[PDB]
């Protein structure tokens, strides 16, 4: 023939991916990536965080010195893992404001204990019980000293322990609540009285309450656990007439990244910066749907099971160009040219516009993958007991956070998918306009994304057009002859 | 010559700035403004808000009547500033749920106190101590009445104080905890007993707990501070046999905008709506990176040190037009024309498209500047003690709020920058298309943002084109003869 057709177009695939946009809920694209991590490995990693496996021991049991927890003395951790199988196997006890002590120690991150010599004169020391069997012998909590009368006298104690160090000291102590009056006389030889433990800043006074309680491990009595924090320069004074479960020393308090998690997942040999109750997860994707309880550099928890971010063009699967459909036969690039001339048909990709679109997509992906925010100690998110308004507030705060981050994830994905599509349409239009301006008056736009070139144009001519070296003037007279018949 | 070139383009600057967009972490723009207020003035200004400088007093010390806080009697404030240098210089005391009373009074915003005549017969009023020296004489808290025995008798008190007002009455009272039993007999001539303070809607019963405590200012005894709120129509009844630190009257509880802040910044003289612990800050920028603790019409706190909002076009630094580069030699506007014809070179800015782009940018700026959210009383954000579960929840709530607002700020700035660039590129394209349409068939698009005008065209026709008065019919025959060789 005496003319040639040069069509511009873009790639397509046999089976694309459906993504969401602001304007179109289900737009088919050539490629997409998942931004929600929906599965875990099933194992907690030993690295990079120090993991202390509580096994049968709860954090409080380790703190008090339950004999089964002897292996946890003076341990440190970044994350303490509490197992659902843990149980107490020592003298029955309770802790007023248990959650606060558990959080306090979990965030401290250490069970390092320093023994101190308290005067404890006129009373006996190291009381034991058949409930706490250590090495086939009656014992007691390893960090507590159960004081009893000496020779049927228990003189009032007024014991001073100054804090001459540069750190806060955590003292754990308790009060014994005997089952009956005979136990009170047998152990203390007098009425319950009261125990006052004080510092310059605060005081705590606890009275024993004699009475029968349901037997736990055949013990009808209870020990209540109290704690106090002694600041540098302060003094701990213990004023007691009986029923005192004395401290044996102090625990250190540190600031840090330590926390406690409840999980039955096994601990394996792996390296992951994000630990969940379901095991560690990858932290590459900006969002996760595995759990709301996280430690470390974890993706934000969202409700969506999946969020797909377009990383490609509208698919529009199937001469004609981009106006009618995409080209399923392209494998070299995303944008390109197809032609029909005097030699035959052909096709070549336009690699500069393909790379420009890819670089813009790479830009969008860079701002999401590997930008994970790191969090450590947080509120409790799961509860086993009904408590009251504080639990309701903690649940409300977590649900609010989840709803807002799920909204942000949905809006972010819809906006980025809309911009990815608009950019790839823009690149197609820029290539079309570039070709039209280069051809100028030597070709007409046929309305299907193709140009009709009104002159003989061989493969070198088409290649010259594709690579930006077409010389407009060389063919102008011939084209005008064909276009207008002079 | 027989042909003129008319090029269109936009300005550029030798050195632009870098902003973030949806697509590009680093896009160079001609101008950008800072939306994060990263520094304070260093002073807390005394207006528009009423500020009461606590000096050496805490709010509770001023509430109780510590001898050093006499200058704070019956004061009101919008913001109470508590200094890190404040210390107690009176009888040692503790407040169960201290944070709640401090918040309660800070929210009320006043120390206005009305005295009431309580019967207090059979006891000695106005007890004093060497710990509280007021005028080189032993004293006690100015708002408390330390009652002791009269003639070695302390009859049971049953004292009624009806609330016949239309507002809530705040009563501050306490319980004496003697160091020894000898002090209990000396002061009250009898056993500790218990103190019950009640209203129709409530009751509080507190037992004295005699025992030695670490001496604070040489006092081994302590006073516990309790408060009660009496609603209109209710009755305050105090039933006590000893150890009572009686009220002298009541404080008003009012609603308002009052709060308390901890800051060592000097108090300055200016008008600044936003006060932070680091001093007052400007509230023009939508975001701040100064502190977490705020009062007044403050910008939202974000974690970014800087967020730059584009206020100009892509720089595209270096006849030819927009497609190849920008024009660094244009200083009279943002858009314009360059000419090359039979007379020589020329250049003139198009001020209408410059103003349209500026108006759109000014719209975005007006939507983002001076639109702060005024907040007053809020939760405590910094803590000096390890408290447990409640403190952890307060920290979690603030961390969640900050992360969500930082996300919103980052997304908003990226969104505004992408829209600013897209709008000014669209305006450039509108000017190019308007020129092309005006030229009709008398010119060709050369592919670099320039038109080849196929006729002799002096400065008068160029000016006609620039101002929209070019008549293509008068030049049609010449343009067609040169362009198509008729």
């Amino acid at each position, epitope marked *: 023939n005496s003319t040639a057709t040069l069509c511009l177009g873009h790639h397509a695939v046999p089976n694309g991916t459906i993504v969401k946009t602001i304007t179109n809920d289900q737009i088919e694209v050539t490629n997409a990536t998942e931004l929600v991590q929906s599965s875990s490995t099933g194992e907690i990693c030993d690295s990079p965080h120090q993991i202390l496996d509580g096994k049968n021991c709860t954090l409080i049991d380790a703190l008090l010195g339950d004999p089964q927890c002897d292996g946890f003395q003076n341990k440190k951790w970044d994350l303490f893992v509490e197992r659902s199988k843990a149980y107490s196997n020592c003298y029955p006890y309770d802790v007023p404001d248990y959650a606060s002590l558990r959080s306090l120690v979990a965030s401290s991150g250490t069970l390092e204990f320093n023994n101190e010599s308290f005067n404890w004169t006129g009373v006996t020391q190291n009381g034991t019980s058949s409930a706490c069997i250590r090495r086939s012998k009656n014992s007691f909590f390893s960090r507590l000293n159960w004081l009893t009368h000496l020779n049927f006298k228990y003189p009032a104690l007024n014991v001073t322990m100054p804090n001459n160090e540069q750190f806060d000291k955590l003292y754990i102590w308790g009060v014994h609540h005997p089952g009956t009056d005979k136990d009170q006389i047998f152990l203390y030889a007098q009425a319950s009285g009261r125990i006052t433990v004080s510092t310059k800043r605060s005081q705590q006074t606890v009275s024993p309450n004699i009475g029968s309680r349901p037997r736990v491990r055949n013990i009808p009595s209870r020990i209540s656990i109290y704690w106090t924090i002694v600041k540098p320069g302060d003094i701990l004074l213990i004023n007691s007439t009986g029923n005192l479960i004395a401290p044996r020393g102090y625990f250190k308090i540190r600031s840090g990244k330590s926390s406690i998690m409840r999980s039955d997942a096994p601990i394996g040999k792996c390296n992951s910066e994000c630990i969940t109750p379901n095991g560690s997860i990858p932290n590459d994707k900006p969002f996760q749907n595995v759990n709301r309880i996280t430690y470390g550099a974890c993706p934000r928890y969202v409700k969506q099971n999946t969020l797909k971010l377009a990383t490609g063009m509208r698919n529009v699967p199937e001469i004609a160009g981009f106006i009618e459909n995409g080209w399923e036969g392209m494998v070299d690039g995303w944008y390109g040219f197809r032609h029909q001339n005097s030699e035959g048909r052909g096709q070549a990709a336009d690699l500069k516009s393909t*790379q420009a679109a890819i670089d813009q997509i790479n830009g969008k*992906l860079n701002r999401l993958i*590997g*930008k994970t925010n790191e969090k450590f100690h947080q509120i409790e998110k799961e509860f086993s007991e009904v408590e009251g308004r504080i639990q309701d507030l903690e649940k409300y705060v977590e649900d609010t956070k989840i709803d807002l981050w799920s909204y942000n994830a949905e809006l972010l994905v819809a906006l980025e998918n809309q911009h990815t599509i608009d950019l790839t349409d823009s690149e197609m239009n820029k290539l079309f306009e570039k070709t039209k301006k280069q051809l100028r008056e030597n070709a007409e736009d046929m309305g299907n994304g193709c140009f009709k070139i009104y002159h003989k144009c061989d493969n070198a001519c088409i290649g010259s057009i594709r690579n930006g070296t077409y010389d407009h003037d060389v063919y102008r007279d011939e084209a005008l002859n064909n276009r207008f018949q002079i | 010559n027989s042909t003129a070139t008319l090029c269109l383009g936009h300005h550029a600057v030798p050195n632009g700035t870098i902003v973030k967009t949806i697509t*590009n972490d680093q*896009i160079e723009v001609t101008n950008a403004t800072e939306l994060v207020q990263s520094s304070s003035t260093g002073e807390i200004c005394d207006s528009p808000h009423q500020i009461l400088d606590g000096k050496n007093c805490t709010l509770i010390d001023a509430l109780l009547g510590d001898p050093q806080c006499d200058g704070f009697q019956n004061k009101k404030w919008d913001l109470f500033v508590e200094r890190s240098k404040a210390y107690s210089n009176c009888y040692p005391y503790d407040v169960p749920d201290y944070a709640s009373l401090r918040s309660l009074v800070a929210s009320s915003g006043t120390l206005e106190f009305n005295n009431e005549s309580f019967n207090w017969t059979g006891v000695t009023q106005n007890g004093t101590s060497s710990a509280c020296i007021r005028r080189s004489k032993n004293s006690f808290f100015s708002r408390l009445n330390w009652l002791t025995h009269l003639n070695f008798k302390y009859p049971a008190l049953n004292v009624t104080m009806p609330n016949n007002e239309q507002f809530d009455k705040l009563y501050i009272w306490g319980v004496h905890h003697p160091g020894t039993d000898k002090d209990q007999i000396f002061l009250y001539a009898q056993a500790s007993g218990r103190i019950t303070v009640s209203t129709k809607r409530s009751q509080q019963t507190v037992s004295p707990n005699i025992g030695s405590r670490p001496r604070v200012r040489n006092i081994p005894s302590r006073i516990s501070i309790y408060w009660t709120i009496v609603k209109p129509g209710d009755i305050l009844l105090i039933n006590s046999t000893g150890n009572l630190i009686a009220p002298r009257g009541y404080f008003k509880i009012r609603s308002g905008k009052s709060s308390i802040m901890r800051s060592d910044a000097p108090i300055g003289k200016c008008n600044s709506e936003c006060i932070t612990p680091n001093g007052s800050i400007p509230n023009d920028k939508p975001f701040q990176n100064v502190n977490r603790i705020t009062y007044g019409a403050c910008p939202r706190y974000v974690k970014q040190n800087t967020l730059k909002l584009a206020t100009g076009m892509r720089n595209v630094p270096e006849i030819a037009g927009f497609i190849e580069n920008g024009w660094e030699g244009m200083v009279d506007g943002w858009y314009g024309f360059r000419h090359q014809n039979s007379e020589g070179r020329g250049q003139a800015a198009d001020l209408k498209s410059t103003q349209a782009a500026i108006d759109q940018i000014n719209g975005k700026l007006n939507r983002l500047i001076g639109k702060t959210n005024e907040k007053f009383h809020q939760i405590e954000k910094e803590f000096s003690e390890v408290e447990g579960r409640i403190q952890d929840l307060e920290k979690y709530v603030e961390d969640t709020k900050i992360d969500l607002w930082s996300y919103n700020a980052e997304l908003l700035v990226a969104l505004e920058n992408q829209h600013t660039i897209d709008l000014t590129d669209s305006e450039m394209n509108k000017l190019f298309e308007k020129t092309k349409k005006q030229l009709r068939e008398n010119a060709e698009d050369m592919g670099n943002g320039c038109f080849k005008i196929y006729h002799k065209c002096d400065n008068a026709c160029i000016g006609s084109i620039r101002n929209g008065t070019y008549d293509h019919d008068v030049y049609r025959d010449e343009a067609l003869n040169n362009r198509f060789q008729i």
Partner: antibody, heavy 125, light 107 residues
Framework: VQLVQSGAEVKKPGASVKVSCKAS????????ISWVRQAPGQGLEWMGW????????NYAQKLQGRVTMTTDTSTSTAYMELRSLRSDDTAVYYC????????????????????WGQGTTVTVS | IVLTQSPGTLSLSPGERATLSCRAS???????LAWYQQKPGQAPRLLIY???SRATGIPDRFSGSGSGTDFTLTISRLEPEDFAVYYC??????????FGQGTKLEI
């Protein structure tokens, strides 16, 4: 994967040097080639990058107007011509695999230069 | 941008932990930073891509980290073969790379 550079060159001031870099073990047009100058002492000065996929280039501002980069797909080679050599340009010149091209990058690996040539040791004056 | 090497590990010995670090004049994405080891007489080889990911076969001791404007190589325990010049690389938005001045880690 291997990159093999040309041998040592000795040039007089005012001359140009063209350093080749032959690739083997990976599709040549799937990645760019970056050129880096290691002067005696001193650190690594990046000189430029060329896309084998589409021919695009990027140059260090200090060398704009002086260095021309080109590729040859059939030989899977890249060339860098440095014009108007001065004695300050004596250095070991390395070629390395650059950015991934034609594929969307999700991993951070493909933003680094993970394959380096031997170094040609070009002496000027 | 421009990177400042601020060398802090010029003289170390086997068994010691390296604290070699790099500060950017502007904050950068962690995905665009990398660490390289250049031995005398050899071309640089890539050690760490991103802020903390190991590239090719490498000893487990070469585990780095960082964020924002401050990145650290953190060599867990040095061996004689680890003494080399270490370079901090930053990738920009454009297909351009910049290197720091180089920290020479020697016996």
């Amino acid at each position: 994967v291997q990159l093999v550079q040309s041998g040592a060159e000795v040039k007089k001031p005012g001359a140009s040097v063209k350093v080749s870099c032959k690739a083997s073990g990976y599709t040549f047009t799937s990645y760019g080639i970056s050129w880096v100058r290691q002067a005696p002492g001193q650190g690594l000065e990046w000189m430029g990058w060329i896309s084998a996929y589409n021919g695009n280039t990027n140059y260090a501002q200090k060398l704009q107007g002086r260095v021309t980069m080109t590729t040859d797909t059939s030989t899977s080679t890249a060339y860098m011509e440095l014009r108007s050599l001065r004695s300050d340009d004596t250095a070991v010149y390395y070629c390395a695999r650059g950015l991934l091209q034609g594929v969307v990058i999700l991993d951070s690996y493909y933003y680094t230069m993970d394959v380096w040539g031997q170094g040609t040791t070009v002496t000027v004056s | 941008i421009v990177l400042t090497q601020s060398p802090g590990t010029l003289s170390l010995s086997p068994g010691e932990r390296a604290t070699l670090s790099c500060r950017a004049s502007q904050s950068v994405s962690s995905s665009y930073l990398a660490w390289y080891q250049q031995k005398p007489g050899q071309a640089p080889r890539l050690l760490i891509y991103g802020a903390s990911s190991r590239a090719t076969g490498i000893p487990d001791r070469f585990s780095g980290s960082g964020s924002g404007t401050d990145f650290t190589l953190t060599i867990s325990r040095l061996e004689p073969e680890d003494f080399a010049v270490y370079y901090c690389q930053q990738y920009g938005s454009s297909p351009r790379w910049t290197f720091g001045q180089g920290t020479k880690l020697e016996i």
